[PDB]
Every structure is written in structure tokens, then in C-alpha cells.
Design a protein around this ligand. Sequence first.
Ligand SMILES: NC(=O)c1ccc[n+]([C@@H]2O[C@H](COP(=O)([O-])OP(=O)(O)OC[C@H]3O[C@@H](n4cnc5c(N)ncnc54)[C@H](O)[C@@H]3O)[C@@H](O)[C@H]2O)c1
Ligand SMILES: NC(=O)c1ccc[n+]([C@@H]2O[C@H](COP(=O)([O-])OP(=O)(O)OC[C@H]3O[C@@H](n4cnc5c(N)ncnc54)[C@H](O)[C@@H]3O)[C@@H](O)[C@H]2O)c1
Ligand SMILES: NC(=O)c1ccc[n+]([C@@H]2O[C@H](COP(=O)([O-])OP(=O)(O)OC[C@H]3O[C@@H](n4cnc5c(N)ncnc54)[C@H](O)[C@@H]3O)[C@@H](O)[C@H]2O)c1
Ligand SMILES: NC(=O)c1ccc[n+]([C@@H]2O[C@H](COP(=O)([O-])OP(=O)(O)OC[C@H]3O[C@@H](n4cnc5c(N)ncnc54)[C@H](O)[C@@H]3O)[C@@H](O)[C@H]2O)c1
Ligand SMILES: OCc1ccc(Cn2cccn2)cc1
Ligand SMILES: OCc1ccc(Cn2cccn2)cc1
Ligand SMILES: OCc1ccc(Cn2cccn2)cc1
Ligand SMILES: OCc1ccc(Cn2cccn2)cc1
Lengths: 267, 267, 267, 267
Amino acid sequence: GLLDGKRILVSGIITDSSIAFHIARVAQEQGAQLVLTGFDRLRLIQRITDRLPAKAPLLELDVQNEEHLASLAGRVTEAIGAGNKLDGVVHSIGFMPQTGMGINPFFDAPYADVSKGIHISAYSYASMAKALLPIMNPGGSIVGMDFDPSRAMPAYNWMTVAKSALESVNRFVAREAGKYGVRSNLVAAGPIRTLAMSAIVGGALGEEAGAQIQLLEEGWDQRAPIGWNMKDATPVAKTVCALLSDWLPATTGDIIYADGGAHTQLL
Amino acid sequence: GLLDGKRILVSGIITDSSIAFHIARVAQEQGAQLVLTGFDRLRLIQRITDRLPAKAPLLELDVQNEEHLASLAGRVTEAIGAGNKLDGVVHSIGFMPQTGMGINPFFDAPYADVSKGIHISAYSYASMAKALLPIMNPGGSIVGMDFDPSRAMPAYNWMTVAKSALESVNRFVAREAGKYGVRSNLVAAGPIRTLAMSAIVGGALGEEAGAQIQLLEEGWDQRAPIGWNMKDATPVAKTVCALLSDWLPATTGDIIYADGGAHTQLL
Amino acid sequence: GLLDGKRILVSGIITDSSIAFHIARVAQEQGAQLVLTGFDRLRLIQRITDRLPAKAPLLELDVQNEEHLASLAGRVTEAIGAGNKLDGVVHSIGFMPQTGMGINPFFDAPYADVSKGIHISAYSYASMAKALLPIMNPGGSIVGMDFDPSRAMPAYNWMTVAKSALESVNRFVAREAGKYGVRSNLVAAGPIRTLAMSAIVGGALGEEAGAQIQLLEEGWDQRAPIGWNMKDATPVAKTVCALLSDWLPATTGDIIYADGGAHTQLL
Amino acid sequence: GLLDGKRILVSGIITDSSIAFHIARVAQEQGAQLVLTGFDRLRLIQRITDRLPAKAPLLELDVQNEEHLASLAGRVTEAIGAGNKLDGVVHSIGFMPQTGMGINPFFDAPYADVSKGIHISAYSYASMAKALLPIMNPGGSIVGMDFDPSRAMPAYNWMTVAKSALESVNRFVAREAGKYGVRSNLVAAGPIRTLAMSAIVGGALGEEAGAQIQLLEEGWDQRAPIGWNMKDATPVAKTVCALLSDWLPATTGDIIYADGGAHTQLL
Ligand SMILES: NC(=O)c1ccc[n+]([C@@H]2O[C@H](COP(=O)([O-])OP(=O)(O)OC[C@H]3O[C@@H](n4cnc5c(N)ncnc54)[C@H](O)[C@@H]3O)[C@@H](O)[C@H]2O)c1
Ligand SMILES: NC(=O)c1ccc[n+]([C@@H]2O[C@H](COP(=O)([O-])OP(=O)(O)OC[C@H]3O[C@@H](n4cnc5c(N)ncnc54)[C@H](O)[C@@H]3O)[C@@H](O)[C@H]2O)c1
Ligand SMILES: NC(=O)c1ccc[n+]([C@@H]2O[C@H](COP(=O)([O-])OP(=O)(O)OC[C@H]3O[C@@H](n4cnc5c(N)ncnc54)[C@H](O)[C@@H]3O)[C@@H](O)[C@H]2O)c1
Ligand SMILES: NC(=O)c1ccc[n+]([C@@H]2O[C@H](COP(=O)([O-])OP(=O)(O)OC[C@H]3O[C@@H](n4cnc5c(N)ncnc54)[C@H](O)[C@@H]3O)[C@@H](O)[C@H]2O)c1
Ligand SMILES: OCc1ccc(Cn2cccn2)cc1
Ligand SMILES: OCc1ccc(Cn2cccn2)cc1
Ligand SMILES: OCc1ccc(Cn2cccn2)cc1
Ligand SMILES: OCc1ccc(Cn2cccn2)cc1
């Protein structure tokens, strides 16, 4: 397999439609040994991850909790065994309060809400790298999930701003990770119909926002020279595994686009 | 003059080396009528602005203070006279706690500090546009100050991340400003020897950081096809005035580089 | 006026809908003294330019003709008077054979045709700078016309490739121009309904291509936060004059977008 | 292996230091069955390729020769067997006459020389895709070699312009390739000490140019968070194989940077 013998931490599983569930599944099909991290609903996450090809230890991780971050490396070492280190880390964590996305005017998002969204979606990429680089092997790889924020778009609003901050954070994380012989990169995915995105398209954050995201999804598939299937996270999961492998060894502080090539076409 | 008859708000003056002092001076030499905003040290700011070519009303504005923002439009209207609106707005506000810049490791900046820096340096660009767009004329212009964060660099650290967030915020502010017939853009300046930057180069944030910024300044002038004079904010001030004028009427959500062309050259 | 006392060469006038006709008109309204260059149909160009606010000498210039380029500086000096130099140069020249644009498959453009298009549209920006920099004043400005080629698009095909080459050429021209104290930049315009573009939208290069360009024009205005009027070259002409002025003195090897801000928005 | 069962065409081998020699070696170590194409010195290329892990048929291909291109698909089919198609294509072809690189002034490169360089280095990426897409399998991959031309640099001169044209061509090739279920991408490599580059650094194109390229190589390794070894093409070859594999299935019209992450850092 592509990831034979590799020990990889995967964060971000919440439902069977989480991009991280598909990253974890593909990594296990490719021979990786996983450690999973989950936020808040651990009973649910364990029941979800019981469907993965192989059993994997699940550790609690709230990226806003300094105690969870400070104990993380020790908890991972206990799970993978003393003397063993991680070869890979997957950050698949994103959050923005409802005031920062959808029909709520861009100017009406309170800073406490924007700040919480940037903490979870951008700053935590650095918090995770800080916690785990001391237990990572040379040749290792840290991968985060991105949504191309180079241009503004309707409805995504402050989540796009958080992704711009994440892209910048990734370039700095690469400088630090390089000292350990570790790569840091993001995968910029096309839109995926997770449970939350299906709810948003269905109008959970207002009708106009849902209508705008549905048009954006259609336009994405139209622009993509190879098409874009929003119901299929497998091409995104494969791309993350490519970055976790030894096959992109000179790429760091960078962004790989798993978007059907849509960002390279105007119409 | 380039800005004859225009009513322009200019924030960010703290010393006679502030980029905003030079923006204000050039705008007044070009016939603009100014309203100034100042943070915390109003007695100092008034004494500084007494050196400007023309007298201008000074209003207090702490961008973290919601009361200051909510009363801002009314305070500006009182200063410029009922029935008059602003033609231009200059955001020349930037801050990052010492833990987020210099020799302090990138991973050691606490989130409360990063969050305060992003609030002042990025979110406030939207807070200012929210407060002032209701009192801006069609054909108007909002300009913010940027430092090219497309690539990571030593010492600037979390200030670079805040600039990446600002660039993203500017693209969204342009969408909102467009409804008022108003443009929103940033000027990405080359490094300027303000009092704070001179202190930083002098080692105020650690020796290695000072050494790295001095090398970055030298490299900037070397790469710039027309050179770069860090002791001269006038070319930056002129660029801001170009954006405040009627001469870039189809440019919005964008970035104009006043950096001697250094970002267009590798060596 | 914005360009009072400036001596500016303007190439590219062919009809009253040429972007260069509007650049020339605005520059003259702003006090510039012009020298015009025209290709092949000089009687037509003289009759067109008789409509400009002021009379201006017209010189023949085929950018593929080495003799025209070698004699150009001497012919301009004769027109503006010995001892006088140019302050500005406008390159508003673009060409691509019909095999390289429209419904003709991208793979069916013969290299002789692509090469002629790149010679006229990209290489000539350097040929013009070579010919005219020896007769340009310090503080001078060279401006070329661009159409954002960062992403592929239907119908524009090899003209987009020629614009990518032009953007690269502009960065090198800036290095050379800098030695003379001269700036080099491009204005990336939104789509303009010139006589040729109206014919193309009308199906002159095939129906599907015309349909695609009409959809691209509509999408441009929709994405533009301040809108985009394809029938109005005046905002583009104003932007060129901004770059020819003393108000963007630290910008070189760069691209200014006069496109209503459309390139900064995805939808 | 990563490329087990895949039939891949590899162009561009001239010496044992050619990036394509290392692409071919890695692809064979990874189970690919190769067809090689060589220009002009076929006896030399055969002797070089005798050192590859496995024997591979060698076909003549001058990309400026229309007869070679028109017969290419038939010659490849004859080599791989009737009923078999290619899964991958590697374009590792680049050329620029000496007048277009080095100390020769940028303005002194005759257009016939620039045109030949753009034909071989950029247009041929489309010529190759045209010839080979009719004999490529769905899920297939076309990869070309790039050198980041986003910013101008000393000495590389018109070769950089040819790479800007190549990047644009790649975006259009992706549109065409997509109709066949085929991806098109470029690998932007850091500087590699091929025989020609060693000669150039040694002063073959002038002393100043050699000095500038040596400084650029040093700066590249300094900026790279994981370092950059110019004497090692293996990380570049691995990246090309990653794109030829099934592990980046949603990436097209794009650029993957195998440069040690140097393009993501300013200093
Ligand atoms: N769905 C899309 O269209 C799309 C597109 C591009 C990128 N992404 C990104 O992919 C990543 C994964 O999101 P997803 O779409 O699979 O959605 P998801 O809801 O399945 O996953 C997001 C995860 O973030 C976790 N999380 C939230 N707050 C946390 C905290 N305080 N500590 C730790 N974990 C926390 C959640 O528990 C959840 O597991 C995110 O970064 C998202 O922005 C999504
Ligand atoms: N100096 C450089 O090299 C450089 C380069 C590019 C961009 N910039 C940007 O230019 C802008 C102006 O900075 P400068 O370099 O002139 O420095 P400065 O210290 O003179 O100005 C920064 C201003 O921010 C103000 N400020 C801080 N916190 C505030 C708050 N809570 N509310 C309101 N105002 C607040 C300060 O009072 C000060 O007037 C900033 O955005 C900065 O990031 C500076
Ligand atoms: N029209 C648009 O939508 C649009 C958008 C962006 C940029 N542009 C660019 O603006 C510039 C001006 O074009 P336009 O749209 O006004 O069209 P146009 O037809 O009015 O002007 C193009 C000019 O190129 C000249 N030209 C062609 N071959 C020449 C040669 N061998 N030597 C000298 N001059 C030669 C023509 O004589 C003509 O004056 C071009 O670079 C074009 O690509 C156009
Ligand atoms: N060496 C570097 O530093 C570097 C960096 C980035 C990208 N590249 C690119 O990598 C690719 C391979 O070049 P390289 O550095 O290995 O050098 P190289 O000299 O080993 O290979 C270039 C190849 O181009 C071939 N070629 C030239 N004219 C041709 C024609 N008319 N028809 C067919 N083939 C022709 C040559 O025969 C040779 O095999 C080129 O695209 C080059 O620009 C090189
Ligand atoms: O908390 C709100 C929220 C989180 C994540 C997503 C997924 N996503 C889409 C684009 C970027 N991320 C969507 C909403
Ligand atoms: O609060 C710390 C601080 C604020 C502003 C500056 C100026 N600057 C340089 C680059 C970007 N901004 C520098 C330090
Ligand atoms: O010779 C064919 C031709 C020349 C110029 C144009 C204008 N243009 C549109 C986009 C870029 N340039 C269009 C066709
Ligand atoms: O024909 C001259 C020539 C060809 C290829 C190279 C390799 N290269 C370096 C950067 C881009 N390509 C260098 C010179």
C-alpha cells in the first residue's frame, strides 16, 4: 500500500460524510496505522469509526483546550507505543459560528464569533503542529484541509477569511516543520456534500445563501475540466494520502488543489 | 489638486513617521479636506497633526471599542457638517502583540494575543467600512494598508497571518462597498522605517529578528527595478491618494503594490 | 490636468472604439501632448484621430518591421522636437490569427499563426521599450494592455497564452526600464466591445465562441462589485492615465486591474 | 509499485543528468512500462537509456517536425502493441537559443530565436497532447516540466517567458485532455544541475549570468524549509510519478511545486 508501515494521526471525524472519515478509510486501505482524534461527541465518533476497515484508538481533542493540546503528544505515544513516532498528521478541522456564514450580513458577524472560527479553523493548524512535531519522524507530513479563498464568494463569508489565515499559517508551520524534516501542506478541496453542507444548501443559513452555494457547486463542476462530484470525497482523500506518502518529498508550505481543476478555469 | 473638494477620513497617525501622517500630508497638498481619527494618545496625535499643511478635526477611535464605532458616523457628520458625506476613508491601522512577532517562536504566540492582532489589523477594516459606508458618497474610496503576505518571512510571523486575513476581508468589504458605489482596495507597501520598525531593526524584538528585517529591507531595494527607499513614505502616500482619486474607477477588492516593484522579481 | 506637460506616445488606434482612442482622448483632456503610432491603414487612422480633442503627429509603426523599430526613436524626436524626450509610452497592440481564437480547436492553431500572435501581442512590448527607452525621461512610464490570463477560458484560446507571455515580458521590461528611472506596467481590462469584439460576439469566429464570450461578459458584470460596462472604455483609459501620471511612482513590473473588481470574486 | 501496469511515454532524455532520465528510472522502479522519445542524437540516447532498470523502445521525436508528430501515435501503438493505449505522457522538453538567456541583453534576443524557444518549450506541450490524447486511456495523465516564472529573474530571461506561456498552454491542454478523462499538469522544479546548467553556472553564457544563477541556487536552498539539493533530481522524478499515478485524481490544469517549498518563502 501507498502508506505501508506509516503511523498517522487523523482529526476531524464527526459523521460518515466527514472528509476525514474518507481520508482515514483510504489511509487504512493503503496500509497506514491510525490514531484518531475527536471533538466533544466521543461516543458518536467511536460508533462512526467502527465502520473503518481497521480498529484505531480514539483520543479526545478540543483544539481550543490548552490542556488537551499539552497532553496530546503523551496520549498519542501511549496509544502507538513508547519508542514509536508519527509519520503523518491530518488536520481536518473547520468551524465558523452561524453569524459568520450564510445570509447574515458580512458586517454583522461579532468579533468574538469570527475569533472563535479563526482559532478553530486556522490557529489550531499551528497548535496541532506544535503539539505533534516533537513526536514526528523525519520524512513526515502534516496535511490540512483548505477551501480556495483567493477570491471572495457569497455565503462562505468569514469561513473564507479563516481559510486565507490558514493558508498563511501553513507557510509558517512549514518553516517550523522543516527543522524536523517534516512537510506541511494543505489540500484545497472542491465543495463536498457533508451533512452540514447539505443542510446549508437546504437553507439552514438562509434561502439566498443555500441558492448561492448550489449555483457555486454547479459552476464548479462546469469549470472543472475533469468534472467535480460533490458527493464523492474519495478523490480528496486520495490527494491527502498522496501528500502523506513519500511521493511528494520536495513540496512544503504549499497547496495542492483537489478540485477537478476548477480553480484553473474561468468559464 | 488630485483630491480637490474631496472629504477624506484618515486613521492611523501616531508619530510624524506614521505612513498615515504622509498620506494625510499628501492628501491635503492635493486639496482634500480631512477628518482624522486617533487611538488612545489624543494629546500627542493633536500635537503631531499640528504639523500638517491644514488644520483638521481629530476624533477618537479605538477599533476594539464598539461604542466608538457605533458613534463614529455621527461624530464625523458633526465634524464635516450636516448634509455632507465622506468621499474617502483611509484605514492605516496595524497591531500585533510582541509574542506574535520577532524572535519569540511562531508556536509560542498565545491565541488571545493573535486574536487581538487580527481584530485590530484585519477585522477592523470591515468594522470601519460598516461604520462609514452609510455616510459615503457614490464614487467613494476605502483604502487599507497591506504588507505582501503571499509568502512567509522571518520575524513578521503572526503580523503576516493578520495581513493574509486583511486581504481576504478587503475582497468581502468590496462586495458591500459596491452597493454604495464605493471602491475598497489595499496598498501593499514595501518596508518603511517608522519609529516602531526602526526599534525592531535595532533589536527591540530580539537580535536575530532585527538582523532578518535589515536583510529583508536590503533585499527589497536590490529586487526593486526602481529601487526602494524605506525612509521615504511619500511614494506610498501618493499611491493611496491615487486610489482615493477618480483615476482608478474600475479597481475594487484589489491590491496595488507600492513596493518599487520588488514583489515582481525573484532576485 | 493629471498629465500636464507630459509627452506621451500612444500606439494601437485603428477605429473610434479602440481602447487606445479613449486612452489618447483622456490623456489629451488631462493636458498631455501626444505622438501617435499607427499600423498599415494610416489614412484611416488619421481620419479617426482627427476626432481627438487636440491635433497629434501620427507615425507609422508595424511592430513586426525591424526598420520601423530602428527608426522609431529618431522619428519621434523629429515630431516632438530635438532636446525633448517622452514621459510616457502606451502599448495598445494585440493580434492573434483566426486559427488561434474562437471555435477552431485549440490544437488546430498552426505554430506560424501562434508565433505571429505572440510576436505582435507580447514580444513587441519589449521591442517598443527597446526602441523608446533611450528617448524617455526619468520618472517616465510604459503601459501595456492586458486581459487576465491567470485561468484558461473558452474562445480566447491562444490570445490568452499571448497575454501570459506579455505579463512575463512586462516583468523583464521593468528591470530594463528601471535603469532609466522608468516604470513598466500593464492594465488588465475587463472585456470591451470594440468593433472586433462586437463581430466575435456576433459569431465572426463561430457561433459557440460568440455565445461563450457573451456569457463571459455577463458573468464579468455580475462578479464585479462595482459592475462592468463593456461599452465604456473610459474607466480603462483613466487607469492607463493613472499609471502614466506621477501618482503611482513605486509600482513597476506590475498589473493594475481595471475590470470592476471581477477578478477578485468567484461568484 | 506506484505505477504498476501503466504504459508511459517519456520524452526529454539527452544525458544521464536529464531530469527525464530520473523520471524514467523512478517510473520503471515503480512498475511502469515505458516508451521513450528522443531528439536528434538517437545513438547517444540509446546508449544513455541502456543504463535504465529496464529496456524500453526509443522513438524519434523532433517537436518542430510536423511529420514526426503526425506519425507519433502510430509509432507508439506499434511499440506498445495494437489494442494497448498509454496511461501517461511526460513532456520534459525545453530549449532557448543562447541569445535569449544569460548576459545577452533581454532586448537583444531576435524574435526568430524567441519563437523557436517558445515553439519547443511551450507550444510543443499542446503538440504532444494533440498527438497522444487519441491513444490515451481514461484516468490518464500528461505531465510537463516547469520552472516558476511568476517573477522575473536574472539570466533565465526569455526561458522564463517561455515557461509563462507553457503554464498558460497547460491550462488549455487540461480542457482538451478532460474530454478523454485525462489530467494535464506541470511540475515546477527547483534548479537542477544538469550538464547544461553546470556549463551555464561555469560561465558558458557569460560570467555575470553564471554568478547570478549560483546565487539563485544558494538562495533557493536557504528559502526552502526542507532545503533544496540541486544535484538530486530524484525528488522531482518522484513528484512527476505522483502525478502519473492514480493518487492525484482531481488535479488538472495545475502546477505542483517540487522545489523544497522555496516559492512559499520570501527569505
Ligand atoms: N465540505 C466542504 O465543502 C469543504 C471544502 C473544502 C474544505 N473543507 C474543510 O475540510 C475540513 C473538514 O470539514 P468537513 O467538511 O469534513 O466537515 P465536518 O463537519 O465533517 O468536519 C469538521 C470537523 O471539525 C471538528 N471540530 C470543530 N470544532 C473543533 C474543535 N474545537 N476541536 C476539534 N475539532 C473540532 C468537528 O468535530 C468535525 O469533526 C474543514 O477544515 C473544512 O473547512 C470542507
Ligand atoms: N511600516 C511598514 O513597514 C509597513 C509596511 C506595510 C504596511 N504597513 C501597515 O501600514 C499601517 C500603518 O502602520 P505604520 O507602519 O504607519 O505604523 P504606526 O505605528 O505609525 O501606525 C499604526 C497605527 O495603528 C493604530 N492603532 C493600533 N491599535 C489601534 C486601535 N485599537 N484602534 C485604532 N488604531 C489603532 C496606532 O495608533 C497607529 O496610529 C498598518 O496597517 C501597517 O501594518 C506598514
Ligand atoms: N477589447 C477587449 O476586450 C480587450 C480586453 C483587454 C485587453 N485588450 C487589449 O487592448 C489592446 C488594444 O486592443 P483593442 O481591444 O482596443 O483592439 P483594436 O483592434 O482597436 O486595437 C488593436 C491594435 O493593434 C494594432 N496592431 C495589430 N497588429 C499590429 C502590428 N503588426 N504593428 C502595430 N500595431 C498592430 C492594430 O492596428 C490596432 O490598432 C490589445 O492589447 C488587446 O489585446 C482588449
Ligand atoms: N534544469 C533545471 O534547472 C530545470 C528546472 C525546472 C525545469 N526544467 C525543465 O525540465 C525539462 C527538462 O530539461 P532538463 O533540465 O532535464 O535538460 P535537458 O537538456 O537534459 O533536457 C531537455 C530536453 O529537451 C530536448 N529537446 C530540445 N529540443 C527538442 C526538440 N526540437 N524536440 C524534442 N526534444 C527536444 C533535448 O533533446 C533534451 O532531451 C525542460 O522543460 C526544462 O526547462 C529544468
Ligand atoms: O462551522 C460551520 C462550517 C464548518 C465547515 C464547513 C465546511 N466548509 C466548506 C467550505 C469550507 N469549509 C462549513 C460550515
Ligand atoms: O504592533 C506591532 C507592529 C505593528 C505594525 C508594524 C508595521 N508593519 C510592518 C509590516 C506590517 N506592519 C510593525 C509592528
Ligand atoms: O487579432 C484578434 C484579436 C485581437 C485583439 C482582441 C481584443 N482582446 C480581447 C481579449 C484580449 N484582446 C481580440 C481579437
Ligand atoms: O536551451 C537552453 C536551456 C534549456 C533548458 C534549461 C533548463 N532550465 C532551467 C530553467 C528552465 N529550464 C536551460 C537552458
